RNA sequence: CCCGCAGAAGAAGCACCGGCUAACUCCGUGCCAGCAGCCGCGGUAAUACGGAGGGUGCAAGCGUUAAUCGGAAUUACUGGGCGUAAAGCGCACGCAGGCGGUUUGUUAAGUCAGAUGUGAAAUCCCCGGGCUCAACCUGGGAACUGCAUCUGAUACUGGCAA
RNA sequence: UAGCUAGUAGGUGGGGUAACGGCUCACCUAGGCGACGAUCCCUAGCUGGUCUGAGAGGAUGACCAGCCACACUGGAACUGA
């Protein structure tokens, strides 16, 4: 019963790619927008819209490159039933550095190398590949 | 398989049992060898397999297989029991070292004589 | 009492003493408080045959530890400086 | 400093003595969950300073009675 | 050169009304040695008649796979029909450390250093379809950066 | 702890000259060599997957005269060291002493090079050493002791080593009977018939 | 009797190489 | 440890060879002897048994047995499954327990960073050094994944309040 | 193997030990522990580490070393830091 709204965000992204759709909508949350801003900065997503006043309907717009899905392997790591907290040195490398690993740290959400650049770690949210 | 269900009841791999109940971690055992006899195998094969029902030292009474071609055993002989199943005689799960304590080695053997204890041709 | 003695390590006929700080009622190789330098009776003409942390050794003399006689000769052999 | 430790009162049916209950979030070794875990300690007090179901600041003092070596300091957020 | 390679050969049956006729399947993999591979599967009534037949279909299914001077770009999974093949890049892992029917594909691919383990079933036909699906599903650093980010050195580090 | 058998029967199983019988006559000049290696050797083998890696490993051991207990111990140090473990194995087999003497031309065979070493006739770095497994340090000197001065093999082998390739990572002084060990040998600089990658896969089974 | 009802002395049936009950998976050799 | 004294003079066995797994075809036996780890070999034309010759793999060791782990992703945390193959309580309610939409403020237990104390020594690894080289011995270091306290970040989880 | 304990959970006072304490007595209170597993049965010295394993883990912990326990069996006390 929507016990993890973050994975509800990733599922729409994953299914939107398989459905060959343009945009995906969902009820917003500040943690959801923060992750998408990391997905936008890396280029996995295409210019989100946060339209809404009292019921904020967050709208990402999917991205395709060579007639194929760009976000093809996404999964949530730190599930609400099982949370993973990596330190500075235990921070992974998705696709040997080719994929990112969104990790919420003290400064905020940032990529796994950006947390390694700042020299801090925390809750790895999702592996995007 | 629900990690919250694993903290409550852990993964438990059943311990594999030894093929031989020969007083654990004893490679060889000493026997008394009552009733040397011969039996026939299961349906694929056919022979008079020479065996003997050994009263072991520790207190068990098992049956062991006599290797080699022809033996020199009797109603009472102190033999040495080596583990090993034949999977051709029902219940035989031990071999007898030819060339041990009292059980002598085979006669006229040339190829594999460390097995069956033949020394060497002294000619 | 506390003492500063030797711990016969090494091999058969190739000894090696590690200068330890231990209680006098131990088994020469056992329970020790702090090892301080070593000694090599079969050392070469090379740079290192004997190392001693004299700052720590003089720290234990103040605490009341007694130096063994073979260890006392190494203080004389090192001449306290070089 | 002081090394205090906070826990909730599980029972107060004793004379000049209370057993407390301290929760501690332990990371499970083999798996990765941060499961919950209790702890019972016999806290000493003055008269009956804490009631039932209250959190209380405890400090490990000198050994009092048989398996009883804890003492309270404050009863913060009491029965009311 | 194209590096033909035999992997497995069986004896299937049919059971006609009289007796049974034995066809011989032959699974071969070809590959130039530069990331181009291809597997042929074909059967005939004779053993050498099928390997020649499996050479023909092998050159029809030539697939190009990127590689980093003799090895993979990143680790990759290879699920196909009960075969859970896993592959590791092994940057100078020194050797094609892989099982039977998974070695022969990666040899003729032109790959030299991998770590691999065939999980699940170890059926030769499916494990070949596992790696062929597994290798073509692997990206390239320039191929990923072409999609998003638009700078090969900026995304990598 | 040595082979002590027919030399070029080992080359017959491989099908190539392993230089362990080499004087002047190439390959028996006659009957059979680089061919049938036994009684039923005229029948061609099938060379299975294990055997291709096996005969690759056996070939290298027959070259340097290293047994399996010892060669595996070179593999331990080769694998734990940095760089390419396939390359470090041929590095440690090269630095082995009897190889170094053989590369000097001081002995005409890797077996003969052990004969000179074992019978205390070679002073490496000035010191007489009879260990055939002596891993020669880089930037070192190897030398023949005076009791082996012109003792009928040193003269005969050094003149035989004129048809060699005169290995680039070394400096032999033919006429002073003293060698000089230069840098670590480069991978591409040695024989290069050996598929070193088949060896590393065998022990990693 | 008892010296004939011994389990050795039983009618032995041979697996014929061809005909009814002749099929073998791999046989004595499997050289490929 | 060096020097000197002879004629190569004193110094090679063990298992295996149907497949797995490197390596054969001829005699003797004839579902009888026997082999075996498993699939299974032996019925008078055996590459599996017993000898011989020839090879292979190891080599002063080589095999066999016992025992642990690995292959076993066949107890799966990393790393599995449950329509039919072993496996969804017959169903529903429900305490303990597990998890939990969204916003702001705050605290700073979980979490992350740094430091200090400790994590004995020897071992396990990294450069060095010394016994003719290695095994061994040994210097320094790293590590000892941990625990506690102190000082910060405080996004996410938890607590409290609205 | 689901209830176990009655000096057992606790208080005051006396005594005792190098030292605190049901460690031991008297009186009073009636609790304490338990499904995050108490009592009971079987088995076993613990650890640094060792063997194996890609890691994670599993198994075992002889030799070297720290600690505990025991010294024909059961029990107690004296000398003495
Ligand atoms: Mg007490
Ligand atoms: Mg097809
Ligand atoms: Mg040896
Ligand atoms: Mg073969
Ligand atoms: Mg035979
Ligand atoms: Mg022979
Ligand atoms: Mg096993
Ligand atoms: Mg396992
Ligand atoms: Mg399963
Ligand atoms: Mg149902
Ligand atoms: Mg039912
Ligand atoms: Mg929440
Ligand atoms: Mg909650
Ligand atoms: Mg910390
Ligand atoms: Mg050291
Ligand atoms: Mg740490
Ligand atoms: Mg509220
Ligand atoms: Mg009192
Ligand atoms: Mg008193
Ligand atoms: Mg494993
Ligand atoms: Mg244990
Ligand atoms: Mg003992
Ligand atoms: Mg012990
Ligand atoms: Mg006694």
UniProtKB/Swiss-Prot annotation, chain C:
One of its GO terms (molecular function) is structural constituent of ribosome. The keyword Metal-binding does not apply. SUPFAM superfamilies: Ribosomal protein S16 (SSF54565). Keywords: Ribonucleoprotein, Ribosomal protein. One of its GO terms (cellular component) is cytoplasm. It comes from the Bacteria. GO terms for biological process: translation. InterPro entries: Ribosomal_bS16 (IPR000307), Ribosomal_bS16_CS (IPR020592), Ribosomal_bS16_dom_sf (IPR023803). It holds the Pfam family Ribosomal_S16. HAMAP family: Ribosomal_bS16. NCBIfam families: S16. Belongs to the bacterial ribosomal protein bS16 family. This is Small ribosomal subunit protein bS16. It comes from Escherichia coli O45:K1 (strain S88 / ExPEC). The gene is rpsP.
UniProtKB/Swiss-Prot annotation, chain G:
Changing residue 12 to A: No change in kcat for peptidyl-transferase by RF2. Residues 14-32 are annotated as: Disordered. Changing residue 25 to A: No change in kcat for peptidyl-transferase by RF2. Residues 17-31 have a biased composition (Basic residues). Changing residue 2 to C: No change in ribosome rescue activity. Disruption phenotype: Cells lacking this gene are viable, but those lacking both arfA and ssrA are non-viable. Rescues ribosomes stalled at the 3' end of non-stop mRNAs. This activity is crucial when the stalled ribosome cannot be rescued by the SsrA(tmRNA)-SmpB quality control system. Binds the 30S subunit, contacting 16S rRNA with the N-terminus near the decoding center and its C-terminus in the mRNA entry channel; contacts change in the presence of release factor 2 (RF2, also named PrfB). Requires RF2/PrfB to hydrolyze stalled peptidyl-tRNA on the ribosome; recruits and probably helps position RF2/PrfB correctly in the ribosomal A site so RF2's GGQ motif can hydrolyze the peptidyl-tRNA bond. Interacts with the 50S ribosomal subunit. Interacts with RF2/PrfB on the ribosome. Contacts ribosomal protein S12 (rpsL). Active protein is only produced when SsrA(tmRNA)-SmpB-mediated trans translation is limited. ArfA can be synthesized from truncated mRNA, via ribonuclease 3 and the SsrA tagging system. In the presence of SsrA, the stalled ribosome is rescued and the incomplete nascent ArfA is tagged for degradation. In the absence of SsrA, truncated ArfA chains are released from the ribosome and are functional. Belongs to the alternative ribosome-rescue factor A family. This is Alternative ribosome-rescue factor A. It comes from Escherichia coli (strain K12). The chain holds residues 17 to 48 of 72 of the full protein.
């Amino acid at each position: 019963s929507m016990q993890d709204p973050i994975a509800d965000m990733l599922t729409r992204i994953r299914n939107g790619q398989a459905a060959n759709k343009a945009a995906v909508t969902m009820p917003s949350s500040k943690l959801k927008v923060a992750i998408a801003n990391v997905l936008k900065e890396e280029g996995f997503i295409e210019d989100f819209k946060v339209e809404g006043d009292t019921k904020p309907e967050l709208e990402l717009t999917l991205k395709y490159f060579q007639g194929k899905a760009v976000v093809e392997s996404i999964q949530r790591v730190s599930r609400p039933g099982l949370r993973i907290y990596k330190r500075k040195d235990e921070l992974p490398k998705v696709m040997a550095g080719l994929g990112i690993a969104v990790v919420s740290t003290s400064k905020g959400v940032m990529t796994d190398r950006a947390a390694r650049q700042a020299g801090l770690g925390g809750e790895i949210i999702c592996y995007v590949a | 398989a629900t990690v919250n269900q694993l903290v409550r009841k852990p993964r438990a791999r059943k311990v594999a049992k030894s093929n031989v109940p020969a007083l654990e971690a004893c490679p060889q055992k000493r026997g008394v060898c009552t009733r040397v006899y011969t039996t026939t195998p299961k349906k694929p094969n056919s022979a008079l397999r020479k065996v003997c029902r050994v009263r072991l030292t520790n207190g068990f009474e098992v049956t062991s297989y006599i290797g080699g071609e022809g033996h020199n055993l009797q109603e009472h002989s102190v033999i040495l029991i080596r583990g090993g199943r034949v999977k051709d005689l029902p219940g035989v799960r031990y071999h007898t070292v030819r060339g041990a304590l009292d059980c002598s080695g085979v006669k006229d053997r040339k190829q594999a004589r460390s097995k069956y204890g033949v020394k060497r041709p002294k000619a | 009492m506390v003492t500063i003695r030797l711990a016969r390590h090494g091999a058969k006929k190739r000894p090696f003493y590690q200068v330890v700080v231990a209680d006098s009622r131990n088994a020469r190789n056992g329970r020790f408080i702090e090892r301080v330098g070593f000694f090599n009776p079969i050392a070469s003409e090379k740079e290192e045959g004997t190392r001693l942390d004299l700052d720590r050794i003089a720290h234990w003399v103040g605490q009341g530890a007694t130096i063994s006689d073979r260890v006392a000769a190494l203080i004389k052999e090192v001449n306290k400086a070089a | 400093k002081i090394r205090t430790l906070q826990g909730r009162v599980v029972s107060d049916k004793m004379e000049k003595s209370i057993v407390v209950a301290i929760e501690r979030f332990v990371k499970h070794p083999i798996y990765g969950k941060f499961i919950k875990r209790t702890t019972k300690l016999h806290v000493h007090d003055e008269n009956n300073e804490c009631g039932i179901g209250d959190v209380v600041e405890i400090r490990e003092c000198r050994p009092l009675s048989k398996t009883k070596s804890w003492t309270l300091v404050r009863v913060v957020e009491k029965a009311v | 050169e194209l590096q033909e390679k035999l992997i497995a050969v069986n004896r299937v049956s049919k059971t006609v009304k009289g007796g049974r006729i034995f066809s011989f399947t032959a699974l071969t993999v070809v590959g130039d040695g530069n990331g181009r591979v291809g597997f042929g599967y074909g059967k005939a009534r004779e053993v050498p008649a099928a390997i020649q037949k499996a050479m023909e279909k092998a050159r029809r299914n030539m697939i190009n796979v990127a590689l980093n001077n003799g090895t993979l770009q990143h680790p990759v999974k290879g699920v196909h029909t009960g075969s859970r093949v896993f592959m590791q890049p092994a940057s100078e892992g020194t050797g094609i450390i892989a099982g039977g029917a998974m070695r022969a594909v990666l040899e003729v691919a032109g790959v030299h250093n991998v770590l691999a383990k065939a999980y699940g079933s170890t059926n030769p036909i499916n494990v070949v379809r596992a790696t062929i699906d597994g290798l073509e599903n692997m990206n390239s650093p320039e191929m990923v950066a072409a999609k998003r980010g638009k700078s090969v050195e900026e995304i990598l580090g | 702890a040595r082979y002590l058998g027919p030399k070029l029967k080992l080359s017959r199983r491989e099908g190539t000259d392993l230089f362990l019988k080499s004087g002047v006559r190439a390959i028996d000049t006659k009957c059979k060599i680089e061919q049938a290696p036994g009684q039923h050797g005229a029948r061609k083998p099938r060379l299975s997957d294990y055997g291709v890696q096996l005969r690759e490993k056996q070939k290298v051991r027959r070259i340097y005269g290293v047994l399996e207990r010892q060669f595996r111990n070179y593999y331990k140090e080769a694998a734990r060291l940095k760089g390419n473990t396939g390359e470090n194995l041929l590095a440690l087999l090269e630095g082995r002493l009897d190889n170094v003497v053989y590369r000097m031309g001081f002995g005409a065979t890797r077996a003969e090079a052990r004969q000179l070493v074992s019978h205390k006739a070679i002073m490496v770095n000035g010191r007489v050493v009879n260990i055939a497994s002596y891993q020669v340090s880089p930037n070192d000197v190897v030398s023949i002791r005076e009791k082996a001065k012109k003792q009928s093999r040193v003269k005969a082998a050094l003149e035989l080593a004129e048809q060699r390739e005169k290995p680039t990572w070394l400096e032999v002084d033919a006429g002073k009977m003293e060698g000089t060990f230069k840098r670590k040998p480069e991978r591409s600089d040695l024989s290069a018939d050996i598929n070193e990658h088949l060896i590393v896969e065998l022990y990693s089974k | 009797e008892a010296l004939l009802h011994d389990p050795l002395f039983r009618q032995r049936v041979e697996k014929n190489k061809k005909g009814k009950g002749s099929y073998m998976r791999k046989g004595k050799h499997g050289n490929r």
